[PDB]
Structures are given as structure tokens and as C-alpha cells.
């Protein structure tokens, strides 16, 4: 199938499709990790297909997903990893590593625009169109709608391609090393957020 569903954790069979980079996004009940639980983890290996894993209330374990997230041999790709890395660390205790963030890379090379959302990035870098629902969706439902399923999958289907396009810009425009040091600090940035520094830049004076 185009989208592969899992309850609680990705199957070993489908975890084995990921031999390189893993594209990933989550869905939650909101933007405060300590208040709003993790509901969905969506993955893609780059081949046009997704794994959508439904996370249950109170579930603190996903052994196969956690293994992938922890695996230093496979890069995990987010658009704004700062948040999802924090969600995964709060829920599972796992420090996702290493990571590539297409929003940080966008801010570092697409210096001519202020539009750094994923939709704007995919339209310019790949000519792909994606749509935003309406902001208001209960991702903790019993049964996710099929709309809910394709929204989640479209968040990870293109991150491989987008990473490649942006990587060539960073190298062309000379800031690939800046992006990589940003990627290495990112899990720390996410843990400071969980600790309450989420609205301050630690590198400022205040």
C-alpha cells in the first residue's frame, strides 16, 4: 500500500525498508509536550510510501521505532526537528540522532525569503503542492480519518528529496558546515526546551 498503518510500533518487516535516511514527523494534542501527548509517528524511506504509527495514551515504549530513532547509522530528517525531537525524548526517553532539519537548512540558504514552512519549501524546491487542513484536528481519535492519514504521510513523503535540494544550496552558497553544527546542537536545543528555556535563546545575553 501507499501508506502502511501500525498500532503502537512499526513492524520489523517495515522497519527493515529503512536502509538509509529516515524521514519523520509526529502528530500530538498540541505544542506543550508535558501537556499534549504524542499520538502519531509518521515515517518514510523516500520511496513514495509511508509508515503511520498510532501511539496510544500513556504508551512510553516503541522498541523498533526507538531503535531507528537512536541509530547513529541512519540520519533522521525533519522539517523543524526542534519540536519533534523534544516530543520523542519526553515520550520515549530516546535522543534522536543524528538529524537533518530542512527548516534550519531553509533558513540558512533560502536567504531571499521569509517563507520557511514545509509547504513553501516543497513548492519552490520540488514544485510539489501540499495542503494544510485547518489547524484543528484531534490526532488522538479512536480511528483516524483517511484524510488524517494522508496529511500525516505528506509531511514525510518529500523530506528526502527536499533534504537533497537544500543540501546542494548549502554547499553552493557555502554554509553546509554551519548547517551541520546546527544539526549537532539540535537535540540539546530540544532538551533545554523541555526544561523550560523554550522561549529564550541560550546564546543570547537574556
Amino acid at each position: 500500500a501507499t501508506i502502511r498503518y501500525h498500532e503502537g510500533d512499526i513492524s520489523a518487516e517495515d522497519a527493515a525498508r529503512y536502509k538509509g535516511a529516515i524521514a519523520i514527523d509526529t502528530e500530538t494534542l498540541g505544542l506543550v509536550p508535558r501537556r499534549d501527548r504524542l499520538c502519531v509517528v509518521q515515517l518514510s524511506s523516500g520511496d513514495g510510501t509511508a509508515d503511520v504509527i498510532r501511539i496510544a495514551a500513556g504508551q512510553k515504549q516503541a522498541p523498533n521505532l526507538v531503535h531507528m530513532l537512536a541509530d547513529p547509522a541512519r540520519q533522521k530528517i525533519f522539517h523543524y526537528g526542534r519540536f519533534d525531537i523534544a516530543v520523542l525524548f519526553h515520550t520515549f526517553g530516546v535522543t534522536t540522532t543524528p538529524v537533518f532539519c530542512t527548516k534550519i537548512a531553509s533558513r540558512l540558504c533560502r536567504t531571499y525569503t521569509d517563507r520557511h514552512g514545509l509547504k513553501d519549501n516543497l513548492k519552490e524546491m520540488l514544485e510539489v503542492d501540499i495542503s494544510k487542513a485547518q489547524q484543528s484536528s484531534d490526532w488522538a481519535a479512536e480511528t483516524l480519518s483517511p484524510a488524517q492519514l494522508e496529511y500525516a504521510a505528506s509531511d514525510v513523503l518529500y523530506l528526502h528529496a527536499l533534504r537533497d535540494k537544500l543540501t546542494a544550496r548549502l554547499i553552493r552558497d557555502g554554509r553546509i558546515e554551519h548547517a551541520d553544527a546546527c544539526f549537532a546542537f539540535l537535540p540539546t536545543r530540544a532538551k533545554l526546551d523541555l526544561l523550560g528555556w523554550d522561549e529564550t535563546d541560550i546564546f543570547a545575553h537574556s
Copy 2:
């Protein structure tokens, strides 16, 4: 206080060799925009109560012995708020200072009960030391640095070893030494992003 060793242009090879471990360091400039306000002074201590104060001439783009200590991965460099000085040294010399310990990032990560993370209050509370802020900001590119100027420059580095050590023990006690080290590792990139114009935005925010 005191005992200041004064140098013109660069630290002599002899005094550089006094530095067998961490290097305390601050600079003085003509202001806060590196591409506009030139580096005037770099000041250095090895943590024994002495300081090397190197005066930097306008247009000078070379400092062999200082640049070697800055680029030397074996000796840590200690600033209070290194984000600024690392950018100034890269813009002036092409040198990327590394590895660093920043006592202001440390202060923020463990001195969570306070908003005063300047050097003066850090020293007073962590070491029971007084330093004096200059009554008015001064011309650091003056033809002759005053005695008061050399003493103010020196005081910027005389206690950084001892402050690093007390803040490290706090970061260990309160469980954030790893968060701090990750900060120090990113800090040179942070300073390079300043010079390129991202200086008033946090690259990790949405905007």
C-alpha cells in the same frame, strides 16, 4: 593589584609558553559591530594572578603567537560571553577559537535563581571578588592605554579559571554539564552566523 605584561601587536613567544593549560581571554574593541569597530586589545591570563595585555593596532591582520593559542585544540579558551569575542577574532585574524568554555552560558544554565549573569555579579557570588565597571566607556584605540584601562582589561580575565571551575561544579551538581558542553561546541558557528547577519535572530526558532 596586579602585574600586567604589556605587548604590542602580539604576545611574545616566552609569555605564550606560560600557558600550559586553559587560557582566559577577553578583548576590547571600539564597539559591538565587528565589521565597523576594530579590535583594540586582547587580554590573557593563565590563572595565576598575572595577565598579558596585547594592544592591537588598526589594520593589523596578523598575530602569530596569539593566533596559535586561539587555534590550538589542546588548550581550552575561557570567555565570559564568548559569542562576541570569537566573532571579533575570526573577523580580525581568520582564526576560529576552539575549544571554548563560556562562563555566561554556564551562568545561565546553572544560576537559574537569578537574571544577573554579567561577569561582575558572577564573580561576586561565585568567588566573593569585586571588579569595577568603568565609570564611562572608554576609547580602547587610544594612543596610550591608561593604567586604569590596563587594569580593567586585566580584571576581565584574572578570575575566569576560578569562575569556570565553580560554575562547572554547579553544572555537575544540577545535571546540565552536557547541555553546557553542547553549547560550547556550537558557539563558534553561532559567532560566525552573527558576522553573516543572523546576529539578531535565533537560527533554531521558526523566525
Copy 3:
């Protein structure tokens, strides 16, 4: 009829339809109770029908309405009760109790959105559409238009259903007790507003 009209007070016959929760909203000349008089009280028992009571200038009495509002055996349901409780206390002297507020409950469980208006709530929680006039309507007119009448009734027709939907979220997501303590403090919050603390949170430092 679908909408039942009253002058000054609800009839005893129509007040008797309310054997459980009373859904309620008001219409006024504006948002300052001491300046802008109460004009309309709209009620619904949950059955698709409304009572719309036209309040006259200077009227400080509505014995049957006031009895319903004061009755601790019947919950009164508002979307943002904070304001209407203050209007009713200023006009009639009545402390409406006990109350359920679908906006407080929305802010407490719909943690994934910032859209907490009634229209947004009804569309997501019940799939119902309602429309906003244009903000500018003289609710003190001689004769209310029939448009004016259905706008007022649509503000109370769904509050029962909406309360039920949101209540199951609060329990699912674990904040029903938080919502109930909010409901108990609400009439105090409204009286502090009438006293001039309306733009400060009393629980802050300032």
C-alpha cells in the same frame, strides 16, 4: 414554533420545558455592562427550539428568568459565560449558578488549536455551521428582525450537544476536574470584572 418570543420574561409554560440544563446567551448594546444595557436573553432546553426574551430599557426584574438562573438544580450553559454572568448580575442582581462554559472547556481540552470561538467549536465538535452577522447590530430595536431572532437562537441551540462533546474530551484527556473548578470560580471572575479588575488576572502578580 421553532423560536418562542417573550416580552420582559419567559412565560411559566415555556420555563417549564427546562427540566435539565439551560443553554443561554444574551445580547446587549456592547461590552461594558455599566454602559450598554441588556436587550435579549436567549434560552434553549436542547430540543432544537429557543425562547428569545426581549428585555426593555431600565427593566431590573424578570422573575421567572431569574428563578431559572438562580436555580442550583439546573446547570446553565454558556460559550464564554464570564461576560453574560456579569450582564445578568448587573441587570437583575442574580448570581447565575451553577454554570458550564464551553469556551473554558474548549481552551482546556482542544489544546491543538487557538480557535476557541463557538463557530469553530460547533464545526469541529458537531459539524454544524453557524454564521456571524457583521458585528454591527442594534439589539435594542423596537422590533427585532427575523434575522436578529435566528442569530440569537443559534447561539443557544447547540450548547447542550457541544457541552456533551467537550465533556467527553475533558474526561478522556483528564481535565474534567480542572474545568469544574474553573466553573465554580467563574461567577466570582465576572463580579471582579464589574468591580473594575476586568483587564487583570487576579491570580497574577499584577
Copy 4:
């Protein structure tokens, strides 16, 4: 001043029994974010001019005698701004402190002629008492609390009975004691909503 009874971990069963009515109480932490800054001290007075100062060790999640007084519905708990400390005690111990009287909510509800609702100015005007704010914020997780620290902690609670009583008579005189009681009843929920992340928004506003 004085007479401070010092305890490690929990108040002894004997001193808990001195408390047959209302309990004055404040805490000290490593800062203002409870999930980050641990509880270090809880301080208690029964209103007789003595205080119990209980030092809380890192990671400690249990305090039998203190948690019994906090959860005990028969003895009121008095804080100046209890919204914060109630959240800290719930996060540290799982205990919901109740019932409470908050002298800062009281100050705001009846001291309508002023903007200064801190403890220091409340005490000066209501009781003609001076307390001293620390010259600089301190490390409350220190290995040994100083004498000055124990005296500052104690002063936080020594006058709360007398201040509660004077503010109560003002709330009665000016007709808002009921508004105040309703506040106190909501205050534990208010503190729990803080811990869940609503801490910078008023749940009763539109946004």
C-alpha cells in the same frame, strides 16, 4: 531575631504537633520553573515567633509529616502568593495543599490604593514590620544553608498569621471577603494549570 528549628528532609513529628491551627509557609527553590528548578527548603511557622526550616535534598520525593500538614483539610495554609509554592509542592510530592489563604491575592483585593503587593511592603504597612530582601539571590541548594539564609527563609513565614488577620479585616470592611475565598478555592487548580503549561495565560480570558 529568632529561634529556628532546623530539619533535614522532613519536620519531626514533635514540631508538627506545635501546629494546631493555621500553618504559615513559604518555600525556596533553585528558580521559577518547577520542572527544572528543584525544591530546596520549605519553611513553616505557627505564628508564635518561631519557625521550622526543612531542608529538602535533591531527588527527595517524600516528606511524611510535612505532606500530612499540607494535605490536612483542618489546618489552613498561609502563603504570600501561594500559586507558585502550591505548584512546587504538588510537583515535588504529589500533594495538593488545601485549604489555603493567599495574602497576595488578599493584598490585591483590598489594598486597592497601591501597586506594591509584595510581602515586604504589605508587612510594613499592615504590621509596621521590616524584612530585608537578600542583597543578591542565593544558591538555596547549597551544602550548608548559611545563618543569613535560614533567617531570610524564616522571615518569609514569621508574620503571615498576623498579615492574614489584618488583610481579612480589610476584606471584611471593604466587602470582598467572599471574592477572596472563591479565589483561594480556585488557587490549587490555578497552580496545576501552571504546571501543565497554561502558566502565562489566564484560563478565563478569550486567549
Copy 5:
């Protein structure tokens, strides 16, 4: 004709149509009277017809217009008189008196809205539609377009009717005396503006 044109001043014949209230608005080169000159004065007697008077550069005199503006026997009606009274005083030296301001009256009785522009007022109070150009029009042109002419006339054609509608609200809602004291202070408010207090309320502390 529907619109009557004049160069420099209104003719005596057309000034004689005004036996009661005079509705009036101006057009200028912008919103700083000392920088942006007066270009057009538009008038209406209430009968569906307008006089549009083109003011020339540097012209400091319009004897018949000034007589009307100065005449305490005839009320002058503006929507936001504060500005135009200042323009007329700067250009001609004339203190327009007495005045009725449909924007002040709108803010005083239409307490249920924040839309106090003339367009919003005419649509609700009279059901009339008017349109806004695009904000950018050179009112000092050689020859005003016919569009320019009807825009200017539509600013004064309805002020009589609008004044009547709003006056009945003020009396109904009990603030006619508040409105009249506002009208008496208005020319002073405009002269303080010309003196440099234009962005402070003189009745505040600062």
C-alpha cells in the same frame, strides 16, 4: 445638476440654497495641514445635490464659503470634523461653528461595534452603499476626474440623514448632552492639533 462645480468659492446663488445645516468635507494633499494644502471643499444642503469647490494653491480666501463656515445660525456637519475644522482654520483663518460630528456621535451611541467609518455608518444607519477609491488620488490636479467629483460629493450627500439617525440614537440611549459638549470642544481640539498636540489627548496625564 446633481453636482455643482465652483472655482475658488461657492457662488452666492448656490450659497443661498443652504437655509439650514450645511454638510461638509474637504479633500487635501494629505493629513498634515501645514504640509498638505486644501484642494476641495464639498458641501450639501441635504437635497441630494452637492457643491464642489476647487481650492487653488496658496488661496487664503473664500468669502462666501467662509461666511457659511463662520455662521452660528447654521450647523456644519462632518464625519470626523476634528481634521477638516483644522484644515479650514489653517487655510482660511475661520473657526467653523457650530458643528455636529457624525463620527463622535457614532462612537457615543453605536457602542456595539468598532466600525465607525462613514461607509459602515451609512450602510447600517441608512442602508446606503458608498465605495472607497484606493486611498491614492492627487486631489490637486488641474482637472478633477468625474470619479473624483462623485467621491467628494458622496462624502456630504448623506450627512444630514446620518445626523438625524444618530441623533435619535443619542437621545434614545441618553448621551445627546455628552455629544453636544463634545461638539462644542471640537474646534479647540482641532486648534491644539495645529499647535502640535495632535497625538496626545490633552485630558490625559501625558
Copy 6:
């Protein structure tokens, strides 16, 4: 200073008759929201160095002799910032005070070289008089007004005649006495619009 005549509820008929011209006047309340903070004191001077200080009891809604002076169109009333006190007297007594002279509107209209338009600085510059702001805001609804309270209340009105006269001569000199009179005429409406809720907006702005 001094000589204060104290009254309970209303000024006696005898002392009212001392007032054959302008009336200086200020009030004291429990705060700045009239519908919440009750009038506690009204203070009056005829400009001879004496003052009448009338204490107002909670709930009192009548003051025959004072309300006659307030409503009396033959004697001008002088406040420093009358916008507030006119609203308080209308809310408490139903009386519209008129006609008024406001020394703060006057100060703003002619003392154009400064931003300090409080009474204290007006008096110091216009009359070379010192008054003292209370060290802390006080409970003006106290059972017994202190001596210090009566002296602070009195000083609010002892110099208003002399300040009115010096500011009038400045308004005449600099050509804005007419602007000032128009202000004074609108000021009661301005205060009534405050009570109705327009208190944080200027009715003459667009919004």
C-alpha cells in the same frame, strides 16, 4: 504648618461661608476606579492658608453643604487634574461640579518645556513651595485619619489658588487661555465619559 478644620460627613454651614470666591479642592479615595474604590475624604481651601478636611463615611450619599458649593456656578472649583475628582463626586453624590479650573490641564498647555506636570513640580517651579508625597500610599478609609494624613490632604489644596493665578498669567502670556477655558468647559463631560467606560480612550480620536 497649618490649621486644619476637621468635619465628619459634611462641612459645617459656618466654614462653607468662609468661601466667597474660588474653592480649592482635592479628594482621597481607596483607589482609582470610582465604582470600586469609595470616596474617603474631600479637602477644601479658600486660599488663606487654612483647610477644611471632610471625612466621608462608607455608603454616604449625601453632603448638603459640600454639594451646594460643588454645584454652585458662582464659585469656581480648582483641582489639579479635576478629571478624576469630578467623576468621583458625581458617582458619590450625583453632583456635577462646575465651573472648574484644572491646574494640570493648565500646566500642560503653558509649561511646554517639561514633561513633569504633577502638583509637586508645578508648585516648586511656579511658587517655590515644597510638598511631600507620602512615603507609601495609605488607607484613606482608616477609622482615624492620622495627623500626617490630614496634613497631606490639606497640602493638596493649600496652594491651588496661587498656582491657578501663576498658570493663568502664563496662559495669557503664551496665548492659550481660550484653549484652556474650552478644556475646563468640556472637563465634566470628560469625567462622565470616564464613568461610563470610555476612560481609556480619547473620544476625539478615530479609536
Copy 7:
């Protein structure tokens, strides 16, 4: 052709078309000259045709373009020259002089509007329509799209005409001398920007 392409520098043949004013705009990788390189210089002599010069990475020389920009006998026309003068000085070391800025002139005479963009100016002053892309375009591409080419040319095709229209306003409304002193200070304003005063007005107190 309507648009004439050049690599690196304008040809001598096409530089010779410019016997009077030179209309000019640039395209870059963004708005920080020290970070975002110069990519395109677009020119027009006023005749409906443009020269579009593609600037290569790291190129610090364009001898013929620089000669034109430096030439005090030919006025260079920008819409907001402040930025492009800084880009040209950073890239080439050239102080463009003398200059006429249609945005400064717009702010000085079109005192009745706040719309001082080029699109708004061309629509009112000349009745010409131009369109904005979408803000997000990589001007450093290998091969500029033909869309990219006409966007760049439309930025300079009308500046001659627009300069003439605005110049007659400045003279009519009496501020031509104010505009000319602004034009003389403009290259200094741009160099202060490159030095870090770009977000302060040097003539203020702070």
C-alpha cells in the same frame, strides 16, 4: 531584442545606448549585502528595452557597468536606491553617482498615500501594471527563467517615465530641492548601512 542578456558585464555596444539617465535595479540572494551576493544588474535607457547582466559568484569586477555607475555625467535612477547603491559598493567598490530615487521622491510628493512601492507608483503615475512574483526566487540559478528575466527588466523599464512624472510633482508641490539634497546624501546613507547603522537614522538622537 526587447531584453538584452550579458554575462558578467554589459557589452560596449549596449553600454553606448546610454547617452542620458540610466535606470537600474539589482537582484541578489537576499537583503544582507555581506551575506547575500549580487546576482543580476538590470539596466534600461528608457526606450522600452533592457540590459540584464548576470553576475557570477565572487565576481568583484564589471569594468563597463562600473564606468556607467561611476559616471557623474549620467544620472542613475532607482526605486529605493539606498539598498542597491550599497550592494554595488560592497560588490564592486563603486560609488554610484549621481542618483535619483523614485521612492524618496514618492515619499516627498505623494503625501496623500502610504503606498510607496514601485507597483503602486507606476499604476497611479503612469497607469502601468506590473506584478510581483511570490518573493521566493533563487536569483543565483545557473539559467534564469524567462519569467525571471522579464521581472528584472520590468523593474527598470519605467523608471525614466516615473522619474519625470514625480519630478513635475516635486516642482509643483515645491520640494524638488528637498529631493535633490536627499539624493546627494543617499550614497552616504548606503555606506553607513554597510557599516552597521542600517537600522538607525543617523540624524536622530539614537
Copy 8:
């Protein structure tokens, strides 16, 4: 200090002739809006330690000898923040003062290490001179200027030659004298744009 030459209306022809080079100059008004607050005093020094203080009467629109020095292209005029005074002199007399040197634009262009660009701090650091700001802003349109007023007016110009010269040497040293001269050339237009209403916007911004 001192030696002040007082003039009514205009400087006498004799004292004007003392001025054979640059002219230091400041004014005093009734406030910051020229169309509202009239010019009261113009003060002048030739840099020898003396000053001419010319009192300007209300409505006066002519000053032959002063207007000649202001309009005279051979003698530079020195203000600290000339943007304001140039606008006041143009509004009062129709004269465009030129050419000018502005020590505040100079201070901002070379004193890049500080935010304090007032005259007082400029003088203290560049010349080691103290001047005193008036304890309170004064009525400069008084019938008789006090001795203190004439001394404060004079001090505004007594050191402007010496401060111009020290700031010029800094602008030369740090490479911005040309930037400064371009500023001075635009400054009269800048002041004329103030009078026309652009006074709170930078004409070189987008908005």
C-alpha cells in the same frame, strides 16, 4: 565662570565682529515644537571662553546681525544636535544656517563604544569638562533671565570649538570624516523636513 555679553533682540555689530572663524551656537525655546514654542534665547561663542547671549522677544521676526552670521557661508556654525536649532532659526527668521558642524552627529559616528551622545558626557570624556544640567527645566521666556539661566545658556556653547576639534580628530582616525561631512550637508534639509511634518520618520527608510 564666565563673562557673558547680554544683548536684547540681536547681537551688537561690535561683538559680531569678534567672530572671525567658526561660531558655536545653541538656542533656548519654550519647548520642542517650533510652530508652538517660540525661540527665547540664542547663545554664541567664538571659542575664547566668552559668550554672547541674545534674548529674543515674543513675535520678533528679525535679527540683522545674527541672521548675517547664520547665513554667512564663510563661518561654520557648530551645534550639538543642530537638527533642532536649525529648524527653530529657519522658522523664526527665514534663515537657513550653513555650513554646519554637528557634534552629536560626530559623536555618534566615532564614539561607537557608547550610547551616551549628549553634550554633558561628550564634554566629560573628550575635554574633561563638567557642565550641569538644570535641576528642573525653566521658563526661558521669563521677563528677566536669571544669572543661573545665562550661565546654563553660555555653557551650551563655551566648549563646542574644542569638542568639534577632538571629535574631528577621532573621525579622521577612524575613517568617517567624509560620512560626517555628508551628514552636515544634508542636515539643513533634514531640519526643513522636520518643520513640514516628517519629523518622526526617516525619509530614507521604506516608511
